[PDB]
Design an enzyme around this catalytic site. Structure first.
Site, PDB file in Angstrom:
ATOM      1  N   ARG A 185      -8.022   1.392  58.787  1.00 38.82           N
ATOM      2  CA  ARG A 185      -7.189   0.283  58.354  1.00 38.82           C
ATOM      3  C   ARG A 185      -5.829   0.304  59.024  1.00 38.82           C
ATOM      4  NH1 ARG A 185      -9.481   0.113  52.109  1.00 38.82           N
ATOM      5  NH2 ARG A 185      -7.883  -1.487  51.799  1.00 38.82           N
ATOM      6  N   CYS A 190      -4.273 -11.982  51.462  1.00 43.45           N
ATOM      7  CA  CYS A 190      -5.396 -11.154  51.895  1.00 43.45           C
ATOM      8  C   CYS A 190      -6.693 -11.966  52.012  1.00 43.45           C
ATOM      9  CB  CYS A 190      -5.543  -9.964  50.943  1.00 43.45           C
ATOM     10  SG  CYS A 190      -4.118  -8.823  51.056  1.00 43.45           S
ATOM     11  N   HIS A 197       1.211  -8.165  49.852  1.00 47.80           N
ATOM     12  CA  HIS A 197       0.680  -8.331  48.513  1.00 47.80           C
ATOM     13  C   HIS A 197       1.452  -7.494  47.514  1.00 47.80           C
ATOM     14  CE1 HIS A 197      -1.329  -4.951  50.513  1.00 47.80           C
ATOM     15  NE2 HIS A 197      -1.292  -4.375  49.324  1.00 47.80           N
TER      16      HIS A 197
HETATM   17  N1  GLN Z   1      -7.351  -0.517  47.961  1.00 46.97           N
HETATM   18  C1  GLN Z   1      -8.524  -1.094  48.201  1.00 46.97           C
HETATM   19  O1  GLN Z   1      -8.789  -1.637  49.271  1.00 46.97           O
HETATM   20  C2  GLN Z   1      -9.546  -1.039  47.082  1.00 46.97           C
HETATM   21  C3  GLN Z   1      -9.668   0.349  46.481  1.00 46.97           C
HETATM   22  C4  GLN Z   1      -9.645   1.446  47.539  1.00 46.97           C
HETATM   23  N2  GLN Z   1     -10.538   1.070  48.671  1.00 46.97           N
HETATM   24  C5  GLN Z   1     -10.049   2.793  46.935  1.00 46.97           C
HETATM   25  O2  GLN Z   1     -10.769   3.548  47.577  1.00 46.97           O
HETATM   26  O3  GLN Z   1      -9.672   3.175  45.820  1.00 46.97           O
END
Ligand code: GLN
Length: 243
Positions: free
Chosen positions: A128, A94, A189
């Site tokens: 994402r 990552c 990951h």
């Molecule tokens: N998973 C990730 O990228 C970090 C934590 C995640 N963004 C969350 O909202 O909990």
């Protein structure tokens, strides 16, 4: 009866996507070939050289964490680059992968400087690339995992393989990760990544070849890992196609 030395970079800072699972797996599979692994924990880089390094690892952190890790690693930019160009094996995950490049761009357009070891960049969106991912690799066979990254990485170097389910580096390429000489980088990951034992054995094989020590027996029992991979393959084959 032989040994390898592993450089483990910034584990204290890079907690979001830890590479510890892969180091544990490296140790396990090395032991099966009568190889003991010496892990060097490197959190401060002044005076670090690579003459005694056989394999290195860089995990992933939050943007804040990765920037801090990158600032410290930049102190040894030139020796790290020279090691990589010499054929040093390594695995980066990552953010550890992304920040090998020139820059990392946040969704609001903020540019964070990478190590600039390789000429590429990453830009992020708030939506994402997320889900199970299956990759067919000429080197690594089938690679399986889970992707969940806002980053889109754009580079012209080798890749880990063609993505048959999921996205990979970006929305369009259907290629995952980077494969530059013996340096590997991936968005995969967590606990599933180490089940891809061919990645682990590649790193070991290349390090043994470079050092001049045997890697025997080359073939060992992988039943458990193959079974674990198949659970994910089967699930991906039953799901909607990712568009
Ligand atoms: N998973 C990730 O990228 C970090 C934590 C995640 N963004 C969350 O909202 O909990």
């Amino acid at each position: 009866m032989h040994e390898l030395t592993i450089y483990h970079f910034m584990s204290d800072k890079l907690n979001l996507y830890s590479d510890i699972g892969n180091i544990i797996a490296l140790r396990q599979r090395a032991k099966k070939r009568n190889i003991k692994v010496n892990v060097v924990e490197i959190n401060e880089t002044e005076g670090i050289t690579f003459d005694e390094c056989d394999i290195f690892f860089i995990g992933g952190g939050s943007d804040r964490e990765q920037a801090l890790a990158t600032k410290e690693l930049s102190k040894i930019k030139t020796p790290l680059k020279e090691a990589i160009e010499d054929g040093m094996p390594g695995l980066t995950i990552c953010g550890g992968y992304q920040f090998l490049g020139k820059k990392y761009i946040t969704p609001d357009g903020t540019e964070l400087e990478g190590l600039g070891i390789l000429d590429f960049y990453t830009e992020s969106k708030t939506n994402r690339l997320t889900g199970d991912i299956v990759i067919e690799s000429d080197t690594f066979g089938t690679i399986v995992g889970f992707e969940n990254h806002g980053g889109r990485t754009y580079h012209d170097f080798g890749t880990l393989g063609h993505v048959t389910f999921g996205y990979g580096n970006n929305d369009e390429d259907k290629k995952e990760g980077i494969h530059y000489k013996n340096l590997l980088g991936t968005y995969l990951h967590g606990p599933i990544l180490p089940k891809n034992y061919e990645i682990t054995d590649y790193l070991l094989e290349k390090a043994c070849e470079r050092k001049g020590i045997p890697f025997e027996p080359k073939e060992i029992d992988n039943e458990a890992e193959i079974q674990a991979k198949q659970v994910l393959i089967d699930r991906a084959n039953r799901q909607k196609k990712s568009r």
